[PDB]
Design a protein around this ligand. Structure first.
Ligand SMILES: O=C(O)Cn1cc(Br)cn1
Length: 165
């Protein structure tokens, strides 16, 4: 069970935490990965979660891509959570650094509604280049299931809490 989270709404919770460390502690049913369409877990949250699985997430993801092809921006797939969670929900938020449509962020968060409870990062934040304040707004206005957000950066966490409407 999740501890130390600030409650933002009926169903959205937030904590300044490293999502890999949080996943190892909680062992949630679902950990969300900040995936790209190719499931190439190189950096940000994806690189960190993959390294914590000793690259097993990448090996499983390469088999998934070989069979199914790439995901869509805004889409997701459920794969194993390995040593971190029961499942990993790989969600592709739009990457502003690839010129992707920020309007797809709501579609990306809709994937969370297929899971009653999730440990997640803010979609499209960090190396995906979107405004994290707007990502949190889309999260609370889209996700209806119980989402526990892990914000890696303390300054960003404090700014997200202090500016939350
Ligand atoms: O804090 C987050 O979860 C997203 N992020 C912002 C920076 Br700076 C580094 N990562």
């Amino acid at each position: 069970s999740f501890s130390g989270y600030l409650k933002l709404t009926d169903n959205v919770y937030i904590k300044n935490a490293d999502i890999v460390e949080e996943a190892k502690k909680v062992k949630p049913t679902v950990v969300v990965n900040a995936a790209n369409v190719y499931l190439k877990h190189g950096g940000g949250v994806a690189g960190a979660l993959n390294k914590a699985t000793n690259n097993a997430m990448q090996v499983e993801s390469d088999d998934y891509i070989a069979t199914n092809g790439p995901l869509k921006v805004g889409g997701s797939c459920v794969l194993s959570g390995h040593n971190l969670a029961k499942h990993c929900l790989h969600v592709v938020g739009p990457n502003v650094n690839k010129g992707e449509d920020i309007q797809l962020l709501k579609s990306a968060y809709e994937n969370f509604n297929q899971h009653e409870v999730l440990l997640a990062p803010l979609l499209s934040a960090g190396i995906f280049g979107a405004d994290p304040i707007h990502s949190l707004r889309v999260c609370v206005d889209t996700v209806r299931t119980n989402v526990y957000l892990a914000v890696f950066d303390k300054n960003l966490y404090d700014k997200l809490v202090s500016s939350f409407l």
